Coordinates of C-alpha atoms and ligand atoms in Angstrom, one line a residue:
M1 CA -0.1 0.3 0.3
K2 CA 1.4 3.0 -1.1
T3 CA 0.1 6.1 0.8
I4 CA -0.5 9.1 -1.3
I5 CA -2.1 12.5 -0.4
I6 CA -3.7 14.6 -3.3
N7 CA -5.3 17.9 -2.6
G8 CA -5.5 16.6 1.3
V9 CA -7.2 13.2 0.6
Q10 CA -5.4 10.6 1.5
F11 CA -5.1 7.5 -1.0
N12 CA -3.8 3.8 -0.2
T13 CA -2.7 2.1 -3.5
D14 CA -0.4 -0.7 -4.9
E15 CA -0.5 1.0 -8.1
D16 CA 2.5 1.7 -10.2
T17 CA 1.5 4.4 -12.4
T18 CA 1.9 8.0 -13.3
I19 CA 0.0 11.1 -11.3
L20 CA -2.2 11.6 -14.3
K21 CA -3.4 8.2 -14.6
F22 CA -4.1 7.8 -10.9
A23 CA -6.0 11.2 -10.6
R24 CA -7.9 10.5 -13.8
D25 CA -8.7 6.9 -12.5
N26 CA -10.0 8.7 -9.0
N27 CA -11.8 11.4 -10.6
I28 CA -9.3 14.1 -9.8
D29 CA -8.9 16.9 -12.5
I30 CA -5.5 17.3 -14.2
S31 CA -5.3 19.0 -17.4
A32 CA -3.3 17.5 -20.1
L33 CA -2.5 18.3 -23.8
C34 CA 0.5 17.0 -25.5
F35 CA 0.1 13.5 -23.8
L36 CA -1.4 11.2 -26.1
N37 CA -0.8 7.4 -27.5
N38 CA 0.8 6.8 -24.1
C39 CA 3.5 9.4 -24.6
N40 CA 4.3 13.3 -24.5
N41 CA 6.1 15.8 -26.6
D42 CA 9.5 14.7 -25.3
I43 CA 11.4 17.7 -26.7
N44 CA 9.5 20.7 -25.7
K45 CA 6.6 19.2 -23.2
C46 CA 3.8 21.3 -22.7
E47 CA 3.8 21.1 -18.8
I48 CA -0.2 21.4 -18.8
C49 CA -0.4 18.6 -16.5
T50 CA 1.7 20.4 -14.2
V51 CA 1.0 19.6 -10.7
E52 CA 3.1 20.5 -7.1
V53 CA 5.0 17.6 -5.3
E54 CA 5.9 18.4 -1.6
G55 CA 9.5 18.5 -1.2
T56 CA 10.0 18.2 -4.7
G57 CA 8.1 20.8 -6.6
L58 CA 6.5 21.7 -9.6
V59 CA 6.1 18.0 -12.1
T60 CA 4.6 16.7 -15.2
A61 CA 2.1 14.6 -14.2
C62 CA 2.2 12.8 -17.5
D63 CA 5.3 11.0 -16.9
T64 CA 6.0 11.2 -13.2
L65 CA 5.3 8.2 -11.4
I66 CA 3.7 7.9 -8.1
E67 CA 5.7 7.2 -4.8
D68 CA 5.1 6.0 -1.2
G69 CA 5.2 9.8 1.0
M70 CA 3.8 11.6 -2.0
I71 CA 1.9 14.8 -1.3
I72 CA 0.5 16.4 -4.2
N73 CA -1.1 19.4 -5.1
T74 CA -2.9 19.9 -8.4
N75 CA -4.6 23.2 -8.0
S76 CA -2.1 25.2 -6.1
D77 CA -1.7 29.2 -7.0
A78 CA 1.8 28.2 -8.5
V79 CA 0.6 25.5 -10.3
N80 CA -2.2 27.5 -12.2
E81 CA 0.0 30.0 -12.6
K82 CA 2.7 27.7 -14.4
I83 CA 0.1 26.1 -16.6
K84 CA -1.7 29.7 -17.5
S85 CA 1.7 31.1 -18.3
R86 CA 2.3 28.2 -20.8
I87 CA -1.2 28.6 -22.4
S88 CA -0.6 32.2 -22.7
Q89 CA 2.6 31.4 -24.9
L90 CA 0.9 29.3 -26.5
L91 CA -1.7 32.1 -27.5
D92 CA 1.2 34.0 -28.6
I93 CA 1.7 31.7 -31.6
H94 CA -2.3 30.8 -32.4
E95 CA -4.6 32.7 -34.2
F96 CA -7.3 32.9 -32.0
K97 CA -10.7 33.0 -34.0
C98 CA -12.7 30.3 -33.5
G99 CA -15.8 31.6 -35.2
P100 CA -15.1 30.3 -38.7
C101 CA -12.6 27.8 -37.2
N102 CA -13.3 23.8 -38.1
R103 CA -12.8 22.8 -34.7
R104 CA -14.9 25.6 -32.8
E105 CA -17.3 22.7 -31.5
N106 CA -14.5 20.5 -30.1
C107 CA -11.1 21.8 -29.3
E108 CA -8.8 21.0 -26.8
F109 CA -6.8 24.2 -26.5
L110 CA -10.1 26.4 -26.6
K111 CA -11.1 24.2 -23.3
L112 CA -7.9 25.0 -22.1
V113 CA -8.2 28.7 -22.8
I114 CA -11.4 29.1 -21.1
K115 CA -10.4 26.6 -18.2
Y116 CA -7.4 28.8 -17.1
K117 CA -8.5 32.3 -18.4
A118 CA -5.4 32.5 -20.2
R119 CA -4.5 35.4 -22.6
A120 CA -1.9 36.2 -25.1
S121 CA 0.9 38.7 -24.2
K122 CA 0.4 39.5 -27.8
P123 CA -2.6 38.5 -30.0
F124 CA -1.0 36.5 -33.1
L125 CA -2.9 38.2 -35.9
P126 CA -0.8 37.0 -39.1
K127 CA -2.5 39.1 -42.1
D128 CA -1.1 36.7 -44.5
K129 CA -2.3 33.0 -44.0
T130 CA -0.7 31.7 -47.4
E131 CA 2.7 31.2 -45.5
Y132 CA 1.1 29.1 -43.1
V133 CA -1.3 26.9 -45.0
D134 CA -0.5 23.8 -46.7
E135 CA -3.2 22.7 -49.4
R136 CA -1.1 20.8 -51.9
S137 CA -2.2 17.7 -50.8
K138 CA -5.4 15.9 -52.3
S139 CA -5.9 14.5 -49.2
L140 CA -4.6 16.8 -45.9
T141 CA -4.1 20.2 -45.3
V142 CA -2.0 22.1 -42.6
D143 CA -2.7 25.2 -41.3
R144 CA 0.1 26.3 -38.7
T145 CA -1.6 29.5 -37.8
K146 CA -3.3 26.8 -35.4
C147 CA -0.3 24.7 -34.7
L148 CA 0.9 24.5 -30.7
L149 CA 4.1 22.3 -31.7
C150 CA 2.8 19.6 -29.5
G151 CA 4.0 16.7 -31.6
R152 CA 1.1 14.9 -31.4
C153 CA 0.8 14.2 -35.2
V154 CA 4.4 13.0 -35.5
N155 CA 3.9 10.5 -32.6
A156 CA 0.6 9.6 -34.1
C157 CA 2.3 8.7 -37.4
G158 CA 5.3 6.9 -36.0
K159 CA 3.3 4.8 -33.5
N160 CA 0.3 4.0 -36.1
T161 CA 2.0 3.6 -39.4
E162 CA 6.1 3.4 -38.8
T163 CA 6.5 5.8 -41.9
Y164 CA 7.4 8.7 -39.8
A165 CA 5.9 10.8 -42.7
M166 CA 5.2 13.4 -40.4
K167 CA 8.2 15.0 -39.0
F168 CA 9.5 18.3 -37.1
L169 CA 11.4 20.6 -39.6
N170 CA 13.5 23.4 -39.4
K171 CA 12.2 26.3 -41.5
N172 CA 13.8 29.4 -41.4
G173 CA 15.3 29.1 -38.0
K174 CA 12.1 28.0 -36.6
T175 CA 10.6 24.7 -35.7
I176 CA 7.4 23.6 -37.9
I177 CA 5.7 20.3 -38.5
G178 CA 5.1 19.0 -42.5
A179 CA 6.3 16.2 -44.8
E180 CA 9.9 15.3 -45.4
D181 CA 11.8 18.1 -46.8
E182 CA 8.4 20.2 -46.6
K183 CA 7.2 18.6 -49.7
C184 CA 3.7 18.1 -50.5
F185 CA 2.9 15.1 -48.5
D186 CA 1.4 13.4 -51.4
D187 CA 5.0 13.1 -52.9
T188 CA 6.6 11.8 -50.2
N189 CA 6.0 8.3 -48.7
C190 CA 3.1 9.4 -46.4
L191 CA -0.2 6.8 -46.7
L192 CA -2.5 10.0 -46.3
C193 CA -4.4 7.8 -43.7
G194 CA -5.1 11.0 -41.7
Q195 CA -4.2 9.4 -38.3
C196 CA -2.1 12.5 -37.8
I197 CA -5.3 14.7 -38.4
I198 CA -6.9 12.8 -35.4
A199 CA -4.1 13.1 -32.9
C200 CA -4.3 16.9 -33.4
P201 CA -6.0 19.0 -30.5
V202 CA -6.9 22.0 -32.7
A203 CA -7.4 22.8 -36.5
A204 CA -3.8 22.8 -37.5
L205 CA -4.3 19.5 -39.7
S206 CA -7.5 19.0 -41.4
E207 CA -8.7 17.0 -44.5
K208 CA -8.6 18.6 -48.0
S209 CA -11.9 19.9 -48.7
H210 CA -14.3 18.9 -51.0
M211 CA -17.2 20.8 -50.2
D212 CA -17.0 23.4 -52.8
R213 CA -17.4 20.3 -55.3
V214 CA -20.4 19.3 -53.8
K215 CA -21.9 22.5 -53.3
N216 CA -21.4 23.4 -56.8
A217 CA -22.7 20.2 -58.2
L218 CA -26.0 20.6 -56.1
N219 CA -26.3 24.0 -57.3
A220 CA -26.0 23.2 -60.8
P221 CA -29.6 22.2 -62.5
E222 CA -27.9 20.0 -65.2
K223 CA -26.1 17.9 -62.6
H224 CA -27.9 14.8 -61.0
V225 CA -26.2 14.2 -57.7
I226 CA -25.8 10.9 -56.0
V227 CA -24.6 10.4 -52.7
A228 CA -23.4 7.2 -51.1
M229 CA -22.0 6.6 -47.5
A230 CA -19.1 4.3 -46.2
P231 CA -19.8 1.8 -43.8
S232 CA -18.5 3.4 -40.9
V233 CA -20.2 6.6 -41.1
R234 CA -23.6 5.1 -39.7
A235 CA -21.2 4.0 -36.7
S236 CA -19.8 7.5 -35.7
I237 CA -21.5 10.5 -37.3
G238 CA -23.9 11.0 -34.3
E239 CA -20.9 11.5 -32.2
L240 CA -20.7 15.2 -33.4
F241 CA -24.6 15.6 -32.5
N242 CA -24.0 14.9 -29.0
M243 CA -25.6 11.3 -29.3
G244 CA -22.8 9.6 -27.7
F245 CA -20.9 6.6 -28.8
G246 CA -22.0 3.4 -30.6
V247 CA -25.3 5.0 -31.8
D248 CA -26.6 3.4 -35.3
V249 CA -27.7 6.7 -37.2
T250 CA -28.2 4.7 -40.6
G251 CA -31.8 6.0 -41.0
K252 CA -31.0 9.7 -40.2
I253 CA -28.3 10.3 -42.3
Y254 CA -30.6 9.2 -45.5
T255 CA -33.3 11.5 -44.1
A256 CA -30.2 14.5 -43.7
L257 CA -29.0 13.6 -47.2
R258 CA -32.3 14.4 -49.0
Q259 CA -32.5 17.4 -47.0
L260 CA -29.5 18.3 -48.1
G261 CA -30.8 18.0 -52.0
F262 CA -29.2 15.3 -53.1
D263 CA -31.1 13.7 -56.0
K264 CA -30.5 9.9 -55.3
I265 CA -29.4 8.2 -51.7
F266 CA -27.3 5.2 -52.5
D267 CA -25.0 3.6 -50.3
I268 CA -21.3 2.1 -50.3
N269 CA -22.2 -0.7 -48.8
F270 CA -23.7 -1.8 -52.2
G271 CA -20.1 -1.2 -53.9
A272 CA -18.8 -3.3 -51.0
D273 CA -20.9 -6.2 -52.1
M274 CA -19.7 -5.7 -55.5
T275 CA -16.3 -6.0 -54.4
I276 CA -16.9 -9.3 -52.8
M277 CA -18.6 -10.4 -56.0
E278 CA -15.5 -9.5 -58.2
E279 CA -12.8 -10.4 -55.2
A280 CA -14.4 -13.6 -54.0
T281 CA -14.4 -14.8 -57.7
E282 CA -10.7 -13.8 -57.8
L283 CA -9.6 -15.6 -55.0
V284 CA -11.4 -19.0 -56.3
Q285 CA -9.8 -18.4 -59.6
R286 CA -6.5 -18.0 -57.6
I287 CA -7.2 -21.2 -56.0
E288 CA -8.1 -23.0 -59.3
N289 CA -5.0 -21.6 -61.0
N290 CA -2.7 -23.0 -57.7
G291 CA -2.0 -18.9 -57.4
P292 CA -0.4 -16.7 -57.5
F293 CA -0.6 -16.3 -53.5
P294 CA -1.1 -14.2 -51.1
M295 CA -3.6 -12.2 -52.9
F296 CA -3.7 -9.0 -51.2
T297 CA -6.9 -6.8 -50.5
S298 CA -6.5 -3.5 -52.5
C299 CA -9.7 -1.5 -51.2
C300 CA -7.7 0.6 -48.8
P301 CA -6.0 3.3 -50.3
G302 CA -3.7 3.7 -47.4
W303 CA -2.1 0.4 -47.9
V304 CA -1.9 0.8 -51.6
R305 CA 0.2 3.6 -51.4
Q306 CA 2.2 1.7 -48.7
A307 CA 2.5 -1.1 -51.0
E308 CA 3.8 1.0 -53.7
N309 CA 6.0 3.3 -51.6
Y310 CA 7.5 0.2 -49.6
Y311 CA 6.4 -3.1 -51.4
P312 CA 6.3 -2.3 -55.1
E313 CA 7.0 -6.1 -55.9
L314 CA 3.4 -7.1 -53.9
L315 CA 1.5 -4.7 -56.5
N316 CA 0.3 -7.7 -59.0
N317 CA -0.7 -9.5 -55.9
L318 CA -3.0 -7.0 -55.2
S319 CA -6.8 -7.7 -56.1
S320 CA -7.7 -6.3 -59.2
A321 CA -11.2 -5.9 -57.9
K322 CA -11.6 -1.7 -57.6
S323 CA -12.4 -0.7 -54.0
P324 CA -16.3 -0.2 -52.7
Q325 CA -16.0 3.5 -53.5
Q326 CA -14.3 3.2 -57.2
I327 CA -16.3 0.2 -58.0
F328 CA -19.5 2.2 -56.9
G329 CA -18.7 4.9 -58.7
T330 CA -17.7 3.1 -62.1
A331 CA -21.2 1.3 -62.0
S332 CA -22.8 5.0 -61.3
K333 CA -21.9 6.2 -64.6
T334 CA -22.8 3.0 -66.4
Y335 CA -25.3 0.7 -64.9
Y336 CA -27.1 3.7 -63.2
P337 CA -27.5 5.7 -66.9
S338 CA -29.1 2.3 -67.9
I339 CA -31.9 1.8 -65.3
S340 CA -32.7 5.8 -65.2
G341 CA -32.4 7.4 -68.4
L342 CA -29.9 9.9 -67.3
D343 CA -27.1 11.4 -69.4
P344 CA -24.0 9.8 -67.7
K345 CA -22.2 13.1 -68.3
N346 CA -24.5 14.7 -66.0
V347 CA -24.4 12.4 -63.1
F348 CA -22.0 13.8 -60.4
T349 CA -21.1 11.2 -57.7
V350 CA -20.6 11.9 -53.8
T351 CA -19.2 9.7 -51.5
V352 CA -19.0 9.9 -47.6
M353 CA -16.2 8.3 -46.2
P354 CA -14.5 8.1 -42.5
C355 CA -11.2 8.6 -44.7
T356 CA -9.1 11.2 -46.0
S357 CA -7.1 8.8 -48.3
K358 CA -9.8 8.0 -50.2
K359 CA -9.5 11.7 -51.7
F360 CA -6.3 10.8 -53.7
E361 CA -7.9 7.5 -54.8
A362 CA -10.9 9.3 -56.4
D363 CA -8.6 11.6 -57.9
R364 CA -6.5 9.3 -59.3
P365 CA -6.0 9.9 -63.0
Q366 CA -7.2 6.6 -64.6
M367 CA -10.4 6.1 -62.2
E368 CA -12.4 7.4 -64.7
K369 CA -13.7 6.4 -68.3
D370 CA -14.8 8.1 -71.3
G371 CA -13.9 11.0 -69.6
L372 CA -16.1 10.4 -66.6
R373 CA -14.5 10.3 -63.1
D374 CA -15.8 7.2 -61.2
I375 CA -16.0 9.1 -58.2
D376 CA -16.4 13.1 -58.3
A377 CA -16.2 14.5 -54.6
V378 CA -15.5 12.5 -51.7
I379 CA -16.5 14.3 -48.3
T380 CA -15.3 12.9 -44.9
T381 CA -17.4 12.3 -42.1
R382 CA -16.6 15.7 -40.7
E383 CA -17.6 17.7 -43.7
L384 CA -20.8 16.0 -43.9
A385 CA -21.8 16.6 -40.0
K386 CA -20.7 20.2 -41.1
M387 CA -23.0 20.4 -43.8
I388 CA -25.9 19.2 -41.9
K389 CA -25.3 21.6 -39.3
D390 CA -24.8 24.6 -41.7
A391 CA -28.1 23.5 -43.3
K392 CA -29.6 24.1 -39.9
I393 CA -30.6 20.2 -40.2
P394 CA -31.9 18.6 -36.4
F395 CA -30.2 15.6 -36.9
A396 CA -30.4 14.1 -33.6
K397 CA -34.3 14.3 -34.0
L398 CA -35.2 13.2 -37.5
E399 CA -37.0 10.2 -38.5
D400 CA -35.7 7.5 -40.3
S401 CA -35.7 6.7 -44.2
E402 CA -34.4 4.1 -46.5
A403 CA -32.1 4.4 -49.1
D404 CA -33.0 4.2 -52.7
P405 CA -32.7 0.6 -53.7
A406 CA -31.4 0.0 -56.7
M407 CA -27.4 0.6 -55.9
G408 CA -28.7 1.3 -51.7
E409 CA -29.4 -2.4 -50.8
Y410 CA -26.6 -4.1 -48.7
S411 CA -26.2 -7.7 -47.3
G412 CA -24.7 -7.9 -43.8
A413 CA -21.3 -8.9 -45.4
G414 CA -20.7 -5.4 -46.6
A415 CA -21.9 -3.9 -43.5
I416 CA -19.1 -5.2 -41.5
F417 CA -16.5 -3.8 -44.0
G418 CA -15.5 -0.9 -41.9
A419 CA -14.2 -3.0 -38.9
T420 CA -10.5 -5.0 -39.3
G421 CA -11.4 -8.3 -40.7
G422 CA -14.6 -7.4 -42.2
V423 CA -13.5 -7.6 -45.6
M424 CA -12.1 -10.8 -44.9
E425 CA -15.1 -12.2 -43.2
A426 CA -17.4 -10.8 -46.1
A427 CA -15.2 -12.3 -48.6
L428 CA -14.8 -15.9 -47.1
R429 CA -18.8 -16.1 -47.0
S430 CA -18.9 -15.5 -50.6
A431 CA -15.6 -17.8 -51.6
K432 CA -16.5 -20.7 -50.0
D433 CA -20.2 -21.0 -51.4
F434 CA -18.5 -20.2 -54.5
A435 CA -15.9 -22.9 -54.7
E436 CA -18.1 -25.3 -53.0
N437 CA -21.3 -24.9 -55.4
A438 CA -22.9 -24.5 -51.7
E439 CA -25.2 -22.3 -49.9
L440 CA -23.4 -22.4 -46.5
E441 CA -25.5 -21.9 -43.2
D442 CA -22.2 -21.5 -41.0
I443 CA -21.0 -17.9 -42.0
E444 CA -19.3 -16.3 -38.9
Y445 CA -15.4 -15.8 -39.0
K446 CA -14.9 -14.5 -35.4
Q447 CA -10.9 -15.9 -35.6
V448 CA -10.5 -12.8 -37.9
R449 CA -12.3 -10.2 -36.0
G450 CA -11.0 -7.8 -32.9
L451 CA -8.3 -5.4 -32.5
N452 CA -5.4 -7.7 -32.2
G453 CA -2.9 -6.2 -34.5
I454 CA -2.0 -9.4 -36.8
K455 CA -4.7 -12.1 -37.1
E456 CA -4.5 -15.5 -38.9
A457 CA -7.2 -18.2 -39.5
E458 CA -6.5 -21.6 -41.2
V459 CA -10.0 -22.0 -43.7
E460 CA -10.9 -25.1 -45.3
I461 CA -12.4 -24.0 -48.9
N462 CA -13.7 -27.5 -51.0
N463 CA -12.1 -30.1 -48.5
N464 CA -8.5 -28.1 -48.8
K465 CA -6.8 -26.1 -46.1
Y466 CA -5.6 -22.4 -46.8
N467 CA -4.5 -19.7 -45.0
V468 CA -5.4 -16.0 -44.3
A469 CA -4.2 -13.4 -42.6
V470 CA -5.8 -9.8 -41.7
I471 CA -3.2 -7.0 -40.8
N472 CA -5.0 -4.5 -38.6
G473 CA -3.1 -1.1 -39.3
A474 CA 0.2 0.1 -41.2
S475 CA 2.7 -0.5 -38.6
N476 CA 1.3 -4.0 -38.2
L477 CA 2.1 -4.6 -41.8
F478 CA 5.7 -3.6 -41.4
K479 CA 5.9 -6.2 -38.5
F480 CA 4.4 -8.9 -40.6
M481 CA 6.8 -8.5 -43.7
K482 CA 9.9 -7.5 -41.4
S483 CA 9.3 -10.1 -38.9
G484 CA 9.0 -12.7 -41.5
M485 CA 5.9 -13.9 -40.4
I486 CA 4.7 -13.8 -43.9
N487 CA 6.8 -17.1 -44.2
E488 CA 5.9 -19.3 -41.3
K489 CA 3.2 -20.5 -43.9
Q490 CA 2.0 -20.0 -47.4
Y491 CA -0.6 -17.1 -46.9
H492 CA -3.5 -17.5 -49.7
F493 CA -5.3 -14.2 -49.0
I494 CA -4.4 -11.3 -47.1
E495 CA -6.8 -7.7 -45.7
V496 CA -4.6 -5.0 -44.9
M497 CA -5.8 -1.8 -43.5
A498 CA -3.9 1.3 -43.0
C499 CA -5.9 2.6 -39.7
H500 CA -6.0 0.5 -36.5
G501 CA -9.3 -0.9 -36.1
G502 CA -10.3 -0.6 -39.6
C503 CA -11.9 2.2 -41.1
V504 CA -14.1 3.0 -37.9
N505 CA -10.9 4.7 -37.0
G506 CA -10.4 6.5 -40.2
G507 CA -8.5 9.9 -40.5
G508 CA -11.4 11.3 -41.7
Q509 CA -13.6 10.3 -38.7
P510 CA -14.8 12.7 -35.6
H511 CA -12.1 13.7 -33.2
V512 CA -12.2 12.2 -29.9
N513 CA -11.2 13.9 -26.7
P514 CA -8.3 12.2 -25.1
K515 CA -10.4 11.5 -21.8
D516 CA -13.2 10.1 -23.5
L517 CA -10.8 7.9 -25.5
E518 CA -9.6 6.7 -22.0
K519 CA -12.8 5.4 -21.3
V520 CA -14.3 4.3 -24.4
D521 CA -13.1 1.8 -26.7
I522 CA -13.8 3.8 -29.9
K523 CA -12.5 1.2 -32.2
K524 CA -14.8 -1.5 -30.6
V525 CA -17.8 0.5 -30.0
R526 CA -18.0 2.1 -33.6
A527 CA -17.3 -1.6 -34.9
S528 CA -20.0 -3.2 -32.8
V529 CA -22.8 -1.1 -35.0
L530 CA -21.6 -2.7 -37.9
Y531 CA -21.5 -6.4 -36.5
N532 CA -25.1 -5.5 -34.9
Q533 CA -25.9 -4.7 -38.7
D534 CA -24.7 -7.9 -39.8
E535 CA -26.8 -9.9 -37.4
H536 CA -30.3 -8.6 -38.0
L537 CA -29.6 -8.3 -42.2
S538 CA -31.9 -10.8 -43.9
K539 CA -29.0 -11.3 -46.7
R540 CA -25.5 -11.7 -45.0
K541 CA -23.7 -13.1 -48.2
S542 CA -22.9 -10.4 -50.9
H543 CA -24.0 -12.6 -53.5
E544 CA -27.3 -12.5 -52.1
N545 CA -28.0 -8.7 -52.6
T546 CA -30.8 -8.6 -54.4
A547 CA -30.5 -5.4 -56.1
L548 CA -26.8 -6.5 -56.9
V549 CA -27.8 -9.8 -58.4
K550 CA -30.6 -7.5 -60.9
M551 CA -27.4 -5.2 -61.5
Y552 CA -25.3 -8.2 -62.8
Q553 CA -27.9 -10.4 -64.5
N554 CA -29.4 -7.1 -66.3
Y555 CA -25.8 -5.6 -67.1
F556 CA -22.5 -6.9 -66.0
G557 CA -23.2 -10.5 -66.4
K558 CA -20.8 -12.7 -64.5
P559 CA -18.4 -11.6 -61.8
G560 CA -14.6 -11.7 -63.0
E561 CA -15.2 -11.8 -66.7
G562 CA -17.1 -9.7 -69.6
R563 CA -18.0 -6.0 -68.9
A564 CA -17.0 -6.8 -65.1
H565 CA -13.7 -7.6 -65.5
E566 CA -13.5 -4.7 -68.2
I567 CA -14.7 -2.0 -66.2
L568 CA -14.9 -2.9 -62.6
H569 CA -11.0 -3.6 -61.9
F570 CA -8.0 -1.8 -61.7
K571 CA -4.6 -3.1 -61.3
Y572 CA -1.2 -0.7 -60.0
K573 CA 2.2 -1.0 -62.2
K574 CA 3.7 1.0 -59.5
Ligands
SF4_601 S1 -7.8 26.0 -33.3 FE1 -9.2 26.1 -31.2 S2 -8.8 28.0 -30.1 FE2 -7.8 27.8 -32.4 S3 -9.0 29.5 -33.3 FE3 -10.0 26.8 -34.0 S4 -11.5 26.7 -31.9 FE4 -10.3 28.7 -31.0
SF4_602 S1 -1.4 10.7 -43.2 FE1 -0.8 8.8 -42.1 S2 1.3 8.3 -42.9 FE2 0.8 10.5 -43.5 S3 1.7 11.8 -42.0 FE3 -0.4 11.6 -41.3 S4 -0.5 9.6 -40.1 FE4 1.9 9.9 -41.3
SF4_603 S1 -0.3 19.8 -36.5 FE1 -1.6 19.5 -34.3 S2 -1.1 17.9 -33.5 FE2 0.8 18.2 -34.7 S3 2.0 19.6 -33.4 FE3 0.5 20.9 -34.4 S4 -0.9 21.4 -32.5 FE4 0.0 19.2 -32.6
SF4_604 S1 -8.1 1.8 -43.1 FE1 -9.9 2.6 -44.3 S2 -10.0 4.6 -43.4 FE2 -8.0 3.8 -42.7 S3 -6.7 4.7 -44.9 FE3 -7.6 2.5 -45.4 S4 -9.5 2.9 -46.4 FE4 -8.9 4.8 -45.2
FES605 S1 0.5 16.6 -21.0 FE1 2.1 16.2 -19.6 S2 3.7 17.5 -20.5 FE2 2.4 17.6 -22.1

């Protein structure tokens, strides 16, 4: 029993832990800023977690271990004035104009300024932002008038991806963050996964806006504007409307989209089922052809960039199926006209994604046919929330509506795509029926679910054994390759997601404050929505999607051949 005193209350504990963590454990208020992902900003520590230890002085609670005999005061005048001082110093480098700011409603810094009634010694009022802003990327943007130089993005990049594509740079004698050599991120090894954005406490890192593309298309009378959301959006956007965590808001989204004026409400889960039709078919062909193995998924553009940038020799092993977004988009410019009378050139296709890398994918030059882009705009979950709020739509009390079914129906296999191992599970449900010419009732592959960084399973397909792996996060791809794990056995099919937890933890998702992250397992809670959908859907195999089956039978023919192979696939040369 360590005996410690905090603010004159006695605690007895066997724990070995920091002052911050014990304080959070025991409902004692200590502020923190740079501490995230189980670090601090090791050079240039923020000191916002300052406390007083009697007999020692002011210490940073986030990395100071409790010890027997400790007497700690978290709220003395000397403590508070130190913290207020540090915040004041940050205000001197911060353009404090919250009105038009994209983090106005959930900013960690604003909360601290209010809490400590901090004041700049000199307001920072840059009158040329162009010098502080980098909007070159198709996916990320930087506004250094907001940057606290807290290093959370640098550490998050390193931990989540191990690319270290986000760096501290010396620019003109001054420290900034940015890409290697202050290049555009896209021109570096960066995956464009946005985990750096998710780690940022302020509006310094953001997604590259596609809001003007959307606005202009909705305002163009001749454009017919389709919208379709990713699996994960329905499991997360409610967080930005005060509804809490793990709330299924699918039906409210469809209603909001109609109120925003979109012409057709479809769903990327339909594209997920399409990807499975193509990719399960391809896997069966590879089985019949004795390879080449392994086949890797190709639906995560962060992973595609990782392969391009670090494992180009694996590109010909990637599934040729387009991702759900791009396969959907392709069909929206071909099949959808065929059942509507729309001129394909007037269809404008918008997706809503939990992802920043999806904007790069959509903008890839060859992701088009007959001069028509597969996908014309990609907005993140955050961008859609802003749109809904700007339109004054009372989201939390909307009535549910349904999608337009022709490219809107989805199976429970497509529904689970947004969680790590979801693609794998979905794919196996169709590949085993396909390979065995059977309709199997046993379809749950729990072995590939959950938050382990690398997962594996042995699957029997048509009386032979196959090995599959699920790589959960870009850093785990590096581990899997570098460790040689990939050689313990012949792998046949491998899912890779760049974001840990899969797309539910993508870089376009709602920010979560670090204290909530401490009490809510965001990856699991968001994923649970998706798995619950699967449990209640009447179709749980992609090839049982009735609108999809109609689409292949009337328009595309059989997967992996004919029209489908010719326009629903994409291969990477580099
Ligand atoms: S980053 Fe935060 S404190 Fe700074 S202007 Fe935006 S909302 Fe205000
Ligand atoms: S987008 Fe991903 S890889 Fe690039 S700097 Fe951010 S966290 Fe690192
Ligand atoms: S961009 Fe954001 S996370 Fe990175 S150092 Fe600046 S304030 Fe911190
Ligand atoms: S895991 Fe999903 S959100 Fe993350 S980069 Fe890949 S596609 Fe995007
Ligand atoms: S939160 Fe402890 S030094 Fe930054």
